[PDB]
Amino acid sequence: HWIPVVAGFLRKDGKILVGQRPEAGQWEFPGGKIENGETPEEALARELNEELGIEAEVGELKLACTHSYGDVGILILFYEILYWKGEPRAKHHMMLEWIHPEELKHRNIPEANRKILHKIYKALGLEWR
Amino acid sequence: HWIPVVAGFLRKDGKILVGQRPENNSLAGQWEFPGGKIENGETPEEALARELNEELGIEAEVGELKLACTHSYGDVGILILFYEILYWKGEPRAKHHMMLEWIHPEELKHRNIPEANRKILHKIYKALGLEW
Numbered sequence: 001h002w003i004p005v006v007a008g009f010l011r012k013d014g015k016i017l018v019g020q021r022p023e024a025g026q027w028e029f030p031g032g033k034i035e036n037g038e039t040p041e042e043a044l045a046r047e048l049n050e051e052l053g054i055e056a057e058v059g060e061l062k063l064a065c066t067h068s069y070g071d072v073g074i075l076i077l078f079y080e081i082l083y084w085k086g087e088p089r090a091k092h093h094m095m096l097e098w099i100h101p102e103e104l105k106h107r108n109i110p111e112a113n114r115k116i117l118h119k120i121y122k123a124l125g126l127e128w129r
Numbered sequence: 130h131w132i133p134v135v136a137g138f139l140r141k142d143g144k145i146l147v148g149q150r151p152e153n154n155s156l157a158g159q160w161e162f163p164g165g166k167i168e169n170g171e172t173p174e175e176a177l178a179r180e181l182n183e184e185l186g187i188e189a190e191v192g193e194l195k196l197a198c199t200h201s202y203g204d205v206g207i208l209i210l211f212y213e214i215l216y217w218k219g220e221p222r223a224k225h226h227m228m229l230e231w232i233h234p235e236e237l238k239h240r241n242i243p244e245a246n247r248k249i250l251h252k253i254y255k256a257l258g259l260e261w
């Protein structure tokens with residue numbers, strides 16, 4: 001039993017966009033579940049819109065990973081988001097931040113992201129140091 | 130309700146590896162890229178190295194992720210991750226598929242392949258370093 005998730009990398013002068021989960025406390029890349037019928041891209045442009053209020057174009061696929069929370073299995077696809085209309089506003093996360101990507105190392109993020117943090121860094125054109 | 134599937138591109142002087150689905154009580158006749166379902170617990174890579182071993186008898190290293198697509202059977206949801214397989218040990222033997230072939234990638238245009246593959250045949254060609 002799987003739940004496919006899509007997530008995007010938006011950048012701003014090097015910094016990356018994470019959002020703070022509402023109802024949990026963790027920071028994460030904007031995105032959400034693929035609904036029945038939609039391509040990953042469609043799901044992501046939609047989630048970016050309803051979470052951020054932006055009209056995003058979905059770029060290259062960067063990474064995929066899996067994670068288990070019990071009998072629950074998530075598959076996350078991460079996509080580079082270069083192009084969008086407007087500026088992201090917090091519609092769903094009780095906070096949004098542009099952070100230095102190095103900060104991920106000491107932000108509370110999904111264990112699914114934590115375990116592949118290095119892969120994420122490369123995908124962002126960076127070095128795990 | 131979703132089913133993540135992983136699949137590989139192996140290449141041989143330009144040609145690409147496809148296998149023919151077992152002429153059996155399965156969704157057969159169709160040619161497809163070697164691979165299979167992600168089992169519980171495994172990363173996409175683990176699932177694919179494993180599937181390439183059971184289907185082909187090769188020890189493959191899984192390379193860079195090229196493509197992801199989805200497809201519906203109304204109620205059934207298939208998500209397919211395609212990976213570049215550059216390195217492996219041995220030569221592929223027909224173990225699961227009732228036929229294996231190295232084909233000119235162009236031949237995909239007139240091969241019976243999963244609709245999930247045909248809908249994005251153009252994306253596949255690019256991911257293979259070619260032009261549609």
Ligand SMILES: Nc1nc2c(ncn2[C@H]2C[C@H](O)[C@@H](COP(=O)(O)OP(=O)(O)OP(=O)(O)O)O2)c(=O)[nH]1
Pocket residue numbers: 005006007028029030031032033074076110112113
């Ligand atoms: N968007 C996003 N989701 C992630 C990330 N890492 C792990 N996930 C997982 C946690 C969640 O189970 C799932 C995202 O589901 P959502 O919270 O967007 O759906 P929703 O708010 O509707 O929750 P619900 O189905 O009502 O319980 O993906 C990430 O970096 N970004």
Ligand SMILES: Nc1nc2c(ncn2[C@H]2C[C@H](O)[C@@H](COP(=O)(O)OP(=O)(O)OP(=O)(O)O)O2)c(=O)[nH]1
Pocket residue numbers: 134135136155156161162163164165166207209243245246
């Ligand atoms: N490996 C691979 N699977 C594909 C491709 N296109 C669509 N699929 C879908 C169809 C199948 O539902 C799924 C692969 O499942 P498997 O054949 O590995 O499972 P199994 O051998 O147990 O047979 P079964 O699906 O239970 O009838 O992926 C492709 O190009 N390569």
